[PDB]
DNA sequence: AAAAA
DNA sequence: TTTTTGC
DNA sequence: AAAA
């Protein structure tokens, strides 16, 4: 009776999967068509998995499969064999891949993507270990960082973390600017009990340019003093009024346990802090709250069904001529002629 | 890999 | 068939 | 180039 759109943006996705037993697999063949380099079996995989992620109900008979879009012939045997035995076959040989094993173990490492990756295991290395006590290799100071706080990174980060973080990113902020907006964005704005790493989106109502410019490097020289700051790459804007990013920093925190209300007496925490003018902070949260599969269906809906073009700092109407503006992340909604999704709905 | 053009 | 897939 |  339920028409499911193609479209994630168009779909309510909460974190209750009745079909983890199919979208695990279906992640994990993603996973490898990523490492393969073939982009289009990836995303074939990754919004089957999204749609099963959306249903109300789990998969128990190929009847349940009918009207579900995303759902092509090597998607369905891949259902139909884990409604055999329990178990997918194609999902388990990825697992005992050599290769996926090797890209899946380096890339668990901060600093470390596809490339140097892929690089590392035709050198024939296949453990961490002989990684790091390699003499030749060498790394950039965002695998040093990654590597020195493995344990401490792989291990993620819960709710009284995000939360102890996100008292520590408001009172750095409003230091310089009082009239800031610290939002926590991410996963954790989607009701995630955990996250690799936590994101916020901070605005200013009455800040300068210049003011907007020094935030993000005010607050992490404060850390830097206090010794907090255990790594931290700062990436200048290149948003272009009338057009890429907002200025945004990659950091890892220092985060001591008298500060989580839930050893060394500390853990190394993943933060990513994001700057906008005020202007555009509809356009950057709506951004930054993923997830990722919401966004990229988000952005194609906009260009495929409404001639529009949508980013994280702007709305464009290609047939009318002209940007659409927006307060709230429902105006950017109601602009695209889309259902309101709440944040908690977008865990496609 | 699936859906559209 | 070719093209697109956040771009 | 590469990591986000
Ligand atoms: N390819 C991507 C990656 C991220 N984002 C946006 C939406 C999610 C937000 C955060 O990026 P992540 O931190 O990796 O997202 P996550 O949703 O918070 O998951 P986690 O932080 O647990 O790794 O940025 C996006 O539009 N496209
Ligand atoms: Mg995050
Ligand atoms: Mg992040
Ligand atoms: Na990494």
Same mark, same amino acid.
């Given at each position: ?14 974190? =209750?999967?009745? +079909? ?5 697999? /279906?992640?994990?063949?993603?996973? +490898? ?36 879009? %995303? ?24 697992? =005992? ?29 296949? $453990? ?27 291990? %993620? ?17 409003? $230091? ?8 926590? $964005? ?9 996250? &690799? ?18 935030? /993000? ?31 945004? %920093?990659? /950091?890892?925190?220092?985060?001591? &346990? ?14 990513? /802090? ?20 919401? *966004? ?6 906009? $260009? ?8 994280? &700092? ?10 659409? *503006?927006?307060?709230?992340? *429902? ?15 977008? =865990?496609?």
């Amino acid at each position: 009776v339920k028409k499911i759109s193609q479209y994630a943006c168009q779909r309510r996705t909460t974190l =209750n999967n009745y +079909n983890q037993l199919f979208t695990d697999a /279906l992640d994990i063949l993603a996973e +490898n068509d990523e490492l393969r380099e073939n982009e289009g079996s990836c995303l074939a995989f990754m919004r089957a998995s999204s749609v099963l992620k959306s249903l109300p109900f789990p998969i128990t008979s190929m009847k349940d499969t009918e009207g579900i879009p %995303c759902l092509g012939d090597k998607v369905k045997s891949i259902i139909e064999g884990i409604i055999e035995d329990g178990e997918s076959s194609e999902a388990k040989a990825v697992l =005992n891949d050599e290769r996926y094993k090797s890209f899946k173990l380096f890339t668990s490492v901060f600093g470390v993507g596809l490339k140097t990756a892929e690089k590392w295991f035709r050198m024939g290395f296949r $453990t961490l270990s002989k990684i790091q006590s390699d003499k030749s290799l060498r790394f950039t100071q965002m695998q040093k960082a990654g590597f020195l706080y493995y344990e401490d990174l792989v291990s %993620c980060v819960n709710r009284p973390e995000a939360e102890a973080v996100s008292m520590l990113v408001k009172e750095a902020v409003v $230091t310089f600017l009082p009239d800031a907006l610290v939002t926590m $964005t991410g996963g954790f704005r989607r009701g995630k009990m955990t996250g &690799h790493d936590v994101d916020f989106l901070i605005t200013s109502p009455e800040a300068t340019e210049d003011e907007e410019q020094q935030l /993000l490097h005010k607050v992490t020289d404060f850390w830097k003093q206090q010794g907090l700051l255990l790594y931290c790459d700062i990436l200048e804007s290149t948003f272009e009024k009338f057009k890429d990013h907002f200025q945004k %920093c990659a /950091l890892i925190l220092k985060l001591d &346990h008298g500060r989580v209300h839930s050893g060394k007496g500390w853990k190394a925490i993943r933060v990513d /802090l994001v700057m906008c003018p005020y202007d555009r902070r509809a356009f950057a949260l709506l951004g930054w709250t993923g997830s990722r599969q919401f *966004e990229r269906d988000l952005r194609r809906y906009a $260009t495929h069904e409404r001639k529009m073009m949508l980013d994280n &700092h702007a709305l464009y109407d290609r047939t009318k001529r002209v940007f659409l *503006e927006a307060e709230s992340e *429902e105006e950017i909604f109601a602009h695209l002629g889309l259902d309101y999704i709440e944040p908690w709905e977008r =865990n496609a």
